[PDB]
């Protein structure tokens, strides 16, 4: 299948209260594997998945120094943006970056990302062509011209098609076993009182991974489009996820409803009902 290596970068200024807080967080296939956090006496790149402990001391030293170089560059950028936007020196501000590559099963680049946001809104992004930029406002136009001048888009393409793909290949080698992990949902239905002659049937899916999942309720084997309640999928805290979907149905008609659970961990989708004990 396809794979991705993505880095999520955060730079948060805090005037009066210190140097900005800088963070780099790396993801292989949407799971955190490394992290640099500048909020320390001696900040170091650290493995966040035990399979990264394979990498030797030179890896950590090299990534650490490059992180610290990045941090200092973003410290400058925060000041630059105060200028572009004519903002006061006193407020806290944020710069965020999503940088990375998605590769197909053949190991060729499928998509590359270089996206920036200032105070939580789009600032600039490299387009799908890996040649041109989309600037979100008048300030980003300045950066856009700057980067057009320096051939930044070309530099990014070289990274995306080279370095990024190559490292992803290496990390996969070191962590593929645990990266392919699935945990099937364990499902059950609960029964809850409603006013008058209605009841709530709640269909739980627990302990699954990855997070992607679908729950549906059917009446007599026919899907219910309106009136299904649910929660956003949520972490259990042990590396797995939870979700539920519920419907309100007539008292005495519970047995006419079935819950269906779709997840990549399962040999086939789950079908279940309220089981009166």
């Amino acid at each position: 299948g396809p794979h991705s290596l993505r880095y999520f970068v955060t730079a948060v200024s805090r005037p009066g209260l210190g140097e900005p807080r800088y963070m780099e967080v790396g993801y292989v296939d949407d799971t955190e594997f490394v992290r640099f956090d500048s909020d320390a006496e001696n900040p170091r790149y650290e493995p966040r998945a035990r399979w990264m402990e394979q990498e030797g001391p030179e890896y950590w030293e090299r990534e650490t120094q490059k992180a610290k170089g990045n941090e200092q560059s973003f410290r400058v950028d925060l000041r630059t943006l105060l200028g572009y936007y004519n903002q006061s020196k006193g407020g806290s501000h944020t710069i965020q970056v999503i940088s990375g590559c998605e590769v197909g099963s053949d190991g060729r680049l499928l998509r590359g990302y270089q996206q920036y946001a200032y105070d939580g809104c789009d600032y600039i992004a490299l387009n799908e062509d890996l040649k041109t930029w989309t600037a979100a406002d008048m300030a980003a136009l300045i950066t856009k011209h700057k980067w057009e001048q320096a051939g930044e888009a070309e530099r990014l393409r070289a990274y995306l098609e080279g370095t990024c793909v190559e490292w992803l290949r290496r990390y996969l080698k070191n962590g593929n076993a645990t990266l392919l992990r699935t945990d099937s949902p364990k499902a059950h239905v609960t029964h809850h009182s409603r006013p008058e002659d209605k009841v709530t049937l709640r269909c739980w899916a627990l302990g699954f991974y990855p997070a992607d999942i679908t729950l549906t309720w059917q009446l007599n084997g026919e899907e219910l489009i309106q009136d299904m309640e649910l929660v956003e999928t949520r972490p259990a805290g042990d590396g797995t996820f939870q979700k539920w979907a519920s419907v309100v149905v007539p008292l005495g008609k519970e047995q006419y409803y079935t819950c269906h659970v779709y997840h990549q961990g399962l040999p086939e989708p789950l079908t279940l009902r309220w089981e009166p004990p």
Binding site: S73, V76, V97, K146, T163
Partner: peptide, 8 residues
């Protein structure tokens, strides 16, 4: 390995 960033 993350890219080295360039100034805005």
């Amino acid at each position: 390995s993350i890219i080295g960033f360039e100034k805005l």
